[PDB]
């Protein structure tokens, strides 16, 4: 009909309102800032025991327990301090993309190409670990799982839909479908009232759990989007794409606040995370190195370069006192 | 230096031993993909071997444990999960010779992407040709020029089969570090599993020699 003509008028009108917002530039804003320095870290506790490619990791809220999933089919819960293992979980499916850890540290979530999300229970009267609830309902592979609390979980799948589940009843309560690509990562708000998720459609979307409907979109990339994470202030997030670049987004302004690139980097980005102060935008690329970049100074400085294969995942302790990154090398390296 | 940490360390060592045993049991097996265009008879192929999301089948033959992963339910961009199978031994690729009535060259396009993909630069491809009886019956009437204009040859079973095989083979670009094993089969054959076994043992020998540095 004539809606596409109207859609062009609205899409053109979108860019107009975007243009008038940039009252200044990040260069003007950050004119009074001391550069951080050539920050470097060293590997100090190397976890080993995985026999295949590692894909995902997540620190617990104790800042002491981390869970990692590999293609060997094993879910290992490490005691980070003594590098000894606490539990080892056999998985039904050996293809895993993401893992998660409950805020209460009593539950574990796994998922992969089997496009089923499974919750595992740790603290039991019996000694071992059993499967509590299995989440069926997606048509495409799960890419990222996160917990709101002990009763709720958000998943993202290749169906290009995100869902939210009540664990006790085991049925969805909200679908997020305005997207058009292939969703890759989720990040919850610090107050857990909203979340954001990029996809192969080169567009980032932010949603709202209560109403279950998209409220923001961005157009800032020429290829697939791989990972997202909230700025610890709950008013921004960062995007890492296949095109060797990262860009930051501010929600109250709805524009690309900053970018970070280089000429030598040509490989993509696999995972992204922030620190407690929000100064460091830690990201692991595909060229066997994990770069460290400051999302305000706009000059990546830290070359975290210990691994032997591509870096796949990285997380930051809730007290902001370390950083762990697993890679296809089958090792987990914790920096501090 | 330990009070309950002695119990912690033994727990860790016991489960590490368990992990090594499970990993050796995993490494004992050989892994194969299974791709197709949907209309391809991958269902008949899996039915030939005796016995939602990703479906896996186990079978053994002459004391060799085979695991096969069948994708095809995922109606998404393949490039994001095609790298998970970056260490499989071989790839089974099926096309239908009765490809003169589809909505064809689409499977050739599928073959081109999979045979030049950067993850499989040194992974062998087993090319199964299916529906040979129906192909002969159909080609007895339909023309080979309907699909291939540049073709020039007899309307004969052997000539058409050889031409199709040649067009599939020359799509390979890295024949120095690659091999395509071709086979004509149908819904009544029984030597397809033995052909798979021969190809797989050849790939195993090749990989062992490449580890030993003699190849």
């Amino acid at each position, epitope marked *: 009909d004539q809606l596409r003509q109207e859609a062009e008028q609205l899409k053109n009108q979108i860019r107009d309102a975007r243009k008038a917002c940039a009252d200044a530039t990040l260069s003007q804003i950050t004119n009074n800032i001391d550069p951080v320095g050539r920050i470097q870290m060293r590997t100090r506790r190397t976890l080993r025991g995985h026999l295949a490619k590692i894909y995902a990791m997540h620190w617990g809220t104790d800042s002491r327990l981390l869970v990692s999933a590999s293609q060997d089919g094993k879910l290992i819960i490490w005691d980070s301090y003594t590098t000894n293992k*606490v539990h080892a979980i056999p998985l039904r499916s050996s293809w895993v993309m993401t893992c998660a850890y409950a805020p209460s540290g009593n539950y574990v979530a796994c998922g992969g190409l089997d496009n089923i999300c499974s919750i595992y229970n740790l603290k039991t009267r019996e000694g071992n670990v059993r499967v509590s609830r299995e989440l069926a309902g997606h048509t495409g592979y799960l890419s990222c799982c996160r917990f709101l609390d002990d009763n709720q979980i958000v998943t993202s799948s290749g169906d290009t839909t995100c869902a939210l589940w009540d664990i006790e009843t085991g049925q969805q309560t909200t679908t997020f479908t305005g997207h058009t690509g292939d969703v890759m990562s989720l990040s919850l708000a610090p107050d857990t009232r909203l979340f954001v998720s990029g996809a192969c459609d080169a567009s980032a979307k932010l949603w709202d759990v209560r109403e279950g409907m998209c409220r923001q979109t961005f157009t800032g990339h020429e290829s697939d989007i791989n990972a997202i994470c909230f700025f610890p202030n709950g008013n921004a997030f960062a995007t890492g794409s296949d095109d060797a670049t990262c860009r930051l987004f501010d929600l109250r302004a709805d524009q690309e606040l900053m970018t970070y690139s280089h000429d030598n980097i040509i490989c993509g980005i696999t995972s992204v995370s922030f620190s407690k102060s929000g100064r460091l935008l830690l990201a692991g690329y595909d060229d066997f190195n994990c770069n460290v970049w400051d999302a305000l100074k706009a000059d990546r400085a830290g070359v975290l370069a210990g691994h032997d294969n591509r870096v796949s995942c990285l997380g930051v302790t809730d007290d902001g006192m370390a950083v762990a990154t697993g890679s296809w090398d089958s090792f987990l390296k914790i920096w501090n | 230096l330990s009070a309950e940490d002695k119990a912690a360390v033994e727990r860790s060592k016991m489960i590490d031993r368990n992990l090594r045993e499970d990993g050796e049991k995993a490494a004992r097996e050989v892994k194969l993909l299974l791709l197709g265009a949907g209309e391809s008879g991958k269902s008949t192929i899996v039915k030939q071997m005796k016995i939602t999301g990703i479906v896996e089948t186990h079978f053994t033959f002459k004391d060799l444990h085979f695991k096969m992963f069948d994708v095809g339910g995922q109606r998404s961009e393949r490039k994001k999960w095609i790298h998970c199978f970056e260490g499989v031994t071989a790839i089974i690729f099926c096309v239908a010779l009765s490809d003169y009535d589809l909505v064809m060259h689409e499977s050739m396009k599928l073959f081109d992407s999979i045979c030049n993909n950067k993850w499989f630069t040194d992974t062998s491809i087993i090319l199964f040709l299916n529906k040979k009886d129906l192909f002969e019956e159909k080609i007895k009437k339909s023309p080979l020029t309907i699909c291939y204009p540049e073709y020039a040859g007899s309307n004969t079973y052997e000539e058409a089969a050889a031409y199709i095989q040649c067009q599939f083979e020359d799509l390979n670009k890295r024949k120095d570090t690659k091999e395509i094993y071709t086979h004509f089969t149908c819904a009544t054959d029984t030597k397809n599993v033995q052909f798979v076994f021969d190809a797989v043992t050849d790939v195993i020998i090749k990989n062992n020699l490449k580890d030993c540095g003699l190849f």
Partner: single-chain antibody
Amino acid sequence: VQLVESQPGGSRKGFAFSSGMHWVRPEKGLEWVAYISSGSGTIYYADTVKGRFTISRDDPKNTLFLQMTSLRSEDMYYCVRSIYYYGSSPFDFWGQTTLTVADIVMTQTSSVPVTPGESVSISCRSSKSLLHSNGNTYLYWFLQRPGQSPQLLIYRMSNLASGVPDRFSGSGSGTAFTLTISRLEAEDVGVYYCMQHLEYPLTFGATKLEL
């Protein structure tokens, strides 16, 4: 969840079993005797009976044998399980069983009367310190009603356990240790105990808290 324990000089002898499991010790006090480390890796015995009391486990059989021999006059006994790892609750489940014939010390106080509702507090005395370098302090409390079994009410003097109403508490400082109950109920009467777990010989305590 289920652990039922089944002539001087003589001799005599659920849930996930494959993963310590200790033994414990007549109108008198109660103390540790002997134990296991899961997986039969490391074994320690009692320094007071070392030589004539044997221990043995059979995971596929799912049993437990304590071969005691050459009975001295220093002779109830009970079986206990302790699935041990970080953040675990060892000794969390005891059972019931009497056979009538240079280290740390854990000396409690004899008794004290109370009334329901009135707050009650307990203290204890140790020999050396218990704050190991790793970061935590090892001591377990055990209520024991008459005609009943001791329970792991508190472990590591800060953490409650399953089934524990959260009116208890705990604290410690060097050697001085405490324990408090806010609102004593009809099911809060019986002798207490203790156990230090830093040096493996587990010196227990003697408090028959009458109403």
